[PDB]
Design an enzyme around this catalytic site. Sequence first.
Site, PDB file in Angstrom:
ATOM      1  N   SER A   1      49.336  40.550  42.861  1.00  9.18           N
ATOM      2  CA  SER A   1      48.169  39.319  42.703  1.00  9.18           C
ATOM      3  C   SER A   1      48.127  39.235  41.173  1.00  9.18           C
ATOM      4  O   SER A   1      47.796  39.901  40.376  1.00  9.18           O
ATOM      5  CB  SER A   1      46.963  39.802  43.461  1.00  9.18           C
ATOM      6  OG  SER A   1      46.244  38.359  43.706  1.00  9.18           O
ATOM      7  N   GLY A   2      47.770  37.770  41.042  1.00 11.20           N
ATOM      8  CA  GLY A   2      47.660  37.228  39.519  1.00 11.20           C
ATOM      9  C   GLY A   2      48.983  37.265  38.657  1.00 11.20           C
ATOM     10  O   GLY A   2      48.694  37.257  37.648  1.00 11.20           O
TER      11      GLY A   2
ATOM     12  N   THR B   1      51.268  31.006  41.898  1.00 12.36           N
ATOM     13  CA  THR B   1      50.775  29.737  42.364  1.00 12.36           C
ATOM     14  C   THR B   1      51.262  28.941  41.527  1.00 12.36           C
ATOM     15  O   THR B   1      51.402  27.745  41.566  1.00 12.36           O
ATOM     16  CB  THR B   1      49.272  29.864  42.621  1.00 12.36           C
ATOM     17  OG1 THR B   1      48.698  31.053  43.431  1.00 12.36           O
ATOM     18  CG2 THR B   1      48.941  28.509  43.106  1.00 12.36           C
TER      19      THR B   1
ATOM     20  N   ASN C   1      42.886  42.809  39.507  1.00 16.03           N
ATOM     21  CA  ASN C   1      42.680  41.549  38.455  1.00 16.03           C
ATOM     22  C   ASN C   1      41.536  40.818  38.880  1.00 16.03           C
ATOM     23  O   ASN C   1      41.280  40.910  40.165  1.00 16.03           O
ATOM     24  CB  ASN C   1      43.985  40.656  38.504  1.00 16.03           C
ATOM     25  CG  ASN C   1      45.091  41.603  37.509  1.00 16.03           C
ATOM     26  OD1 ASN C   1      46.048  42.054  37.989  1.00 16.03           O
ATOM     27  ND2 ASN C   1      44.537  41.620  36.406  1.00 16.03           N
TER      28      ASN C   1
ATOM     29  N   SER D   1      41.747  36.790  41.970  1.00 18.30           N
ATOM     30  CA  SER D   1      42.731  37.096  43.051  1.00 18.30           C
ATOM     31  C   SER D   1      42.513  36.424  44.152  1.00 18.30           C
ATOM     32  O   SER D   1      41.395  36.096  44.551  1.00 18.30           O
ATOM     33  CB  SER D   1      42.576  38.759  43.388  1.00 18.30           C
ATOM     34  OG  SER D   1      43.560  39.064  44.629  1.00 18.30           O
ATOM     35  N   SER D   2      43.410  35.930  45.049  1.00 16.56           N
ATOM     36  CA  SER D   2      43.159  34.862  46.239  1.00 16.56           C
ATOM     37  C   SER D   2      42.948  35.820  47.513  1.00 16.56           C
ATOM     38  O   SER D   2      43.526  36.861  47.691  1.00 16.56           O
ATOM     39  CB  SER D   2      44.105  34.147  46.538  1.00 16.56           C
ATOM     40  OG  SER D   2      44.584  33.140  45.464  1.00 16.56           O
TER      41      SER D   2
ATOM     42  N   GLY E   1      51.055  40.957  47.803  1.00 17.26           N
ATOM     43  CA  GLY E   1      51.689  42.046  48.413  1.00 17.26           C
ATOM     44  C   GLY E   1      51.080  43.467  47.910  1.00 17.26           C
ATOM     45  O   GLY E   1      51.107  43.971  46.913  1.00 17.26           O
TER      46      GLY E   1
ATOM     47  N   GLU F   1      48.037  45.000  48.039  1.00 19.92           N
ATOM     48  CA  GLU F   1      46.823  44.898  47.027  1.00 19.92           C
ATOM     49  C   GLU F   1      46.095  46.160  47.596  1.00 19.92           C
ATOM     50  O   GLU F   1      45.001  45.806  48.196  1.00 19.92           O
ATOM     51  CB  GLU F   1      46.350  43.792  47.069  1.00 19.92           C
ATOM     52  CG  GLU F   1      45.168  43.551  45.777  1.00 19.92           C
ATOM     53  CD  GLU F   1      44.312  42.223  45.888  1.00 19.92           C
ATOM     54  OE1 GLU F   1      43.639  41.827  44.825  1.00 19.92           O
ATOM     55  OE2 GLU F   1      44.457  41.432  46.921  1.00 19.92           O
TER      56      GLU F   1
END
Lengths: 367, 181, 586
Positions: C34-35, C39, C81, C84-85, C340, C342
């Site tokens: 993530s991060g 995106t 992080n 994160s989404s 992936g 997390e």
Amino acid sequence: TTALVCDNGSGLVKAGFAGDDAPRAVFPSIVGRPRHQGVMVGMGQKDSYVGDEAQSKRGILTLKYPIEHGIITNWDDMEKIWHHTFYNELRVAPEEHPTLLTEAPLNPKANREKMTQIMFETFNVPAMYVAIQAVLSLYASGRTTGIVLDSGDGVTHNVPIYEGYALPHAIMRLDLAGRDLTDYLMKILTERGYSFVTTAEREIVRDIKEKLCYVALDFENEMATAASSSSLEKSYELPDGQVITIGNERFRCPETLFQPSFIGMESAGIHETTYNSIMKCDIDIRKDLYANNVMSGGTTMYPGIADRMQKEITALAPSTMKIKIIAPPERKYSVWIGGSILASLSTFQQMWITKQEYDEAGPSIVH
Amino acid sequence: TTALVCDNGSGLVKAGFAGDDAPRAVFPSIVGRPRHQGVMVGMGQKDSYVGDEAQSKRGILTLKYPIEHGIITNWDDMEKIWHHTFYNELRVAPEEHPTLLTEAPLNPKANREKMTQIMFETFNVPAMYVAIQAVLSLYASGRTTGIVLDSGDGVTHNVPIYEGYALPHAIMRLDLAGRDL
Amino acid sequence: LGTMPPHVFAIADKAFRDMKVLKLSQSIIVSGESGAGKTENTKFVLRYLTESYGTGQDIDDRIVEANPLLEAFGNAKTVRNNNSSRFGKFVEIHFNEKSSVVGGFVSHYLLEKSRICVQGKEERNYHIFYRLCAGASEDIRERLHLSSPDNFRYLNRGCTRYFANKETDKQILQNRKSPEYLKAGSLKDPLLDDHGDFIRMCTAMKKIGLDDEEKLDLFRVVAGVLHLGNIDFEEAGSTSGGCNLKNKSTQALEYCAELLGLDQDDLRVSLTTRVMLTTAGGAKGTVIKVPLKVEQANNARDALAKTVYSHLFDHVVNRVNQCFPFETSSYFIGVLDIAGFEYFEHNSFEQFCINYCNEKLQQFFNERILKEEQELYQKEGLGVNEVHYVDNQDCIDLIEARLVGILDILDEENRLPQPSDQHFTSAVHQKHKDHFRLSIPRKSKLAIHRNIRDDEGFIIRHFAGAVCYETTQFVEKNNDALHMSLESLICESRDKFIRELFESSTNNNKDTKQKAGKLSFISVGNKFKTQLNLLLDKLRSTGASFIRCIKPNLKMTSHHFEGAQILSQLQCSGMVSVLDLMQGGF
Ligand SMILES: Nc1ncnc2c1ncn2[C@@H]1O[C@H](COP(=O)(O)OP(=O)(O)O)[C@@H](O)[C@H]1O
Ligand SMILES: [Mg+2]
Ligand SMILES: [Mg+2]
């Protein structure tokens, strides 16, 4: 696939598949043969009208309730209740549903054997289980401990269950409620100049048993306020056009549930049978039986119970100890919503008697 | 690394690592099987609850103290005490702790060997010692001489120690307290 | 082939000629921790397809601008992080038979609804609530009944600090600062600024279609979820009822009925009761009310809050989907953006849903990246022999398996009277046969797993590593049961905007004897399994391409390569085994 919860009340036999909402069919259980000569001669009339058609046809039949103090009137009429219910109401396939039938805690054998065997040979269900009506009210109540009151016509029962084991030496069966409350209401209604001698006319009494009765604040003091007649006397109108105005007897009929001297049995009222069942439980456990006192059924639906029952028990039970009585709405369907919770839960789907087990044992080894 | 002091209480088993302050586990000791029919949907309930949870279930179990007259009842309940305590109380790792077990001076053999041996084979202990409960009270008192009283439910004992020798001609064991009290 | 040096646009040109060769739709799946830019590199791909091949969309810019807008709604702060989404968006850019670009569609999968109710200790809730209590003016915050985070039940756990620059910090008035903000001030980041991102949210709201007055009705829904959470419940009944409310929650219930538009008296006898009827079971009847428990009043309030945020997020994406709607179709290019593996040092239910989605994506990667590619090496002239992959299908049929899987023991605990997280943990090892994919914390030699007792959590060995999950509040998180009296009140709200948050297929006609009262419990774990296998049918039925983004360091610093931090993202994402099947005889 989904199992069927069918509760053998004496009312008010209740039927609906396993969860998640209200019973599909509730009906007044009576069978009645036509006791008059129907000189119009269509002919085409049923030999036995079942409920509900037998509660439309009041006065042209002779009503016979299927069970009399938890024992069958004959299995010819009991099987006919079941067949009528399954086929022309629910419209269920017998080979498609595992069924669940209910019984009473201390009910005489071989009424559960003979039942289980007849329902397996007649309707050919692929699995069956029989739960006692008090145990199902625990699951509906959602507590883990407590004394359960299954009070329906014509047998009430008092079963203590603790976290979540059963105590064998403290189970009490009182034959006091509810058909004797019907008969006592019928015995004190003659005093006001009208009478209901027939099987059909007993139903009119049953409707006044629902709606019009009330329970005392305290007996001795309600008897005091009884000398004032305005609030006491309420006038009901009955389906034959007649208006009956009943006084003392309005609180007298439910009051029967405390001190059944009126019925003449030597056993004590629900008040004292509760206390004597609690003090037949183990010394350590009694502390948490208090405040898990749970009422259930439809005959606990009179207005002044349970808060009469509470105030009376709390006086006889130990000081400091908190006696909280548990009487939520829905209690007439408590047993049934209980049964729904049970038959929906895995793994205990696999504690049902399956067809292979029945084929081996027949009417043997139920428990 | 650190050693573990586990006192094989008569009562009242006591457990906590070595140095400094008080034991980390005290519990009544009991193992208890369920003495009534289980009507509930249930059905994960333990067939044997150890303490403290077996003291949260009074009246629905049949309590059996695992050490009676200073002797183990059977090693089946005793091992279950050990396993329950080590795993869900102390949260100790098997080979990280040198252990310390306690005994009584006139308690019959082969109760201390079979214990020591089974505990080495079951938990895989890296080092072990077994002290009598009276000897441990010498360190607690901080004296080097005197007659010592380890009195628990149900065996007391009376050991005289002199700077810092043991006297074989003066050791007395009484079955006078405390389960008989 | 051979004229493109490695780049992201060498992947985007390749997954457009397979639309013209074999004529099958292609799904771009961006993997990585993530991060990592999954995106941001995706916005470069959407610009490349509408230049090099596609003859443009309606307007480019809205898709780019509204993406951080939906990240206000879906992003939070995690241990790994800061940005994160907590949602798995799936872009569906449609084309047609000729291959003309007809429009787009943005959805969402795996929305962390649980986060609304519980925020941990160093995590936030959603990033839109901190931009509304920080960025909203003083003739706006008194009107929406807002105050500092410590006043809200859904913001009295986790982090209450705002992400704000030194100049920004002093330009937020002191009344909007919590005791933790007084204790330790703002959270520091160079790109995350909560008051700045409230301006780039509301500017982007008027870029997707909203009126400035229509953003205020969106603010009444977010503030109504905050002032719903504040209702604190208690016990009731002389002969036992079930539940009541607390005295201080009378002023809070009035401001909640003022923001939502539903009446206070009709909500007070709905959060406290289970309404049912006897009309259905007979020829005549009545409608009674059966009081709920105190924990079921709080869990129903939490299910009602998660139900409103579910439909507000779906109503907002429908407003965005309306700003570039499609036309006739046949080909389409999807773009996945999901995190992936997390996992942290304290793992719960939502990290098990992430790792369960990773076991299905890795079983997808073994039959789309390894099986098909080595069948093409075995047919395109060379004829190369097979190398077998290392299977993990048994771990999937431990998590989601019918009747003997983990969610089939978790969902059976909620239906049971008196649900317990210790009874569910002991039932997992009691139903399990003790095979290598699952074991108790006491069977792990790690020190971090030493402190966990055997009835307080369980260890699943996953393909990317062994992850321990604590079972504190596990059963509580799976409940989401929406009571029928509350459905004929929040959907049928008096206020039109609130009522129009619901539409087809969610809203539908009903009539008596339909024949039963469902969906009752609903189940969170089977809500995500139903939409995950429904998205699995769209991945196995369509083509695909794989881009994986690795962070050079976890601080997001330029010109700094760290050999321990980069290696762990290569070891927790499927690399070594996939690069052992591919080697073979050539
Ligand atoms: N409102 C009411 N007040 C008093 N008695 C009632 C009321 N409603 C139903 N009853 C009585 O309760 C009985 C039904 O009880 P029920 O719970 O069906 O027992 P069971 O389930 O054992 O058949 C009926 O016979 C009726 O006389
Ligand atoms: Mg009954
Ligand atoms: Mg001793």
